[PDB]
Structure 1
Amino acid sequence: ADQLTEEQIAEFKEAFSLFDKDGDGTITTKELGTVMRSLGQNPTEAELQDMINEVDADGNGTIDFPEFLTMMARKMKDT
C-alpha cells in the first residue's frame, strides 16, 4: 500500500500534472530529471540513470505514472 500521507498526494499530483501534458498520463524520460527537481529532489546521476533503465525496458522513452511513483518509493531505506 502507499506509505505517503494523503496531503502529500495533492502536491505530487500538481507536479506530475504540469509535465504529463501528453494527454494520457505519460512523461518523457528527458524531463524525468526536471519533475524531481521541481519537487526539490536531486539524487546521484548514477541513481537517475538506473531508475530510468529499469522501467524503460522497451526503450520507448516514456514513463507511465505508476512507474515513476514506484521509483519514488524504492529509493528510500524501507523497513
Structure 2
Amino acid sequence: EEEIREAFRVFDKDGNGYISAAELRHVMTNLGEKLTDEEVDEMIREADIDGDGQVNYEEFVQMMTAK
C-alpha cells in the first residue's frame, strides 16, 4: 500500500490526488515505457471506471493490483 501510495504521489506532480493521462506519459516515457496517446487512452479507459478520463488512487490500485 505505501509503495502504491508513494508511487501514486510521485505521478501526481501537482498533488491534485489524480493522475492525468499526460502525467502517465511523463512517468511511462521516463520509466523507459514509450506509449502513444492512444495506448495511454487504452490504459486510462481500462483503469478509468468513472469515465472521468483520469486514474484516481482506487483505480490505480485495481489497475496495478488487479487480482
TM-score category of the 2 structures, normalised to the smaller one: 0.5 to 0.7
Secondary structure in 1 matching 2:65: helix
- Structure 1: 4+ residue segments shifted above 6 A: none
1:62 aligns with 2:54: yes
TM-score w.r.t. the length of structure 2 is: 0.54
Contact 1:27 1:64 in 2 (8 A): yes
Once superposed, what is the RMSD of the aligned Cα atoms?
Answer: 3.2
- Cα deviations across residues 5-47 of structure 1 (Å, max 9, x unaligned)? xxxx32322221131601xx21212112334567x57386576
1:21 aligns with 2:15: yes
1:51 is displaced (CA, Å) by 2.0
Q: Which residue of 2 aligns with 1:42?
A: 33
1:51 aligns with 2:43: yes
Distance 2:63 2:4 in 1: 13
Same amino acid, percent of matched pairs: 32
Larger radius of gyration: 1
Contact 2:20 2:54 in 1 (8 A): yes
Structure with more helix by fraction = 2
Contact 2:21 2:40 in 1 (8 A): no
Secondary structure in 1 matching 2:58: helix
Q: Which amino acid aligns with 1:63?
A: V
Which segments of 5 or more consecutive residues in structure 1 lack a partner in the other structure? 1-8
Which segments of 5 or more consecutive residues in structure 2 lack a partner in the other structure? none
Distance 1:37 1:50 in 2: 16
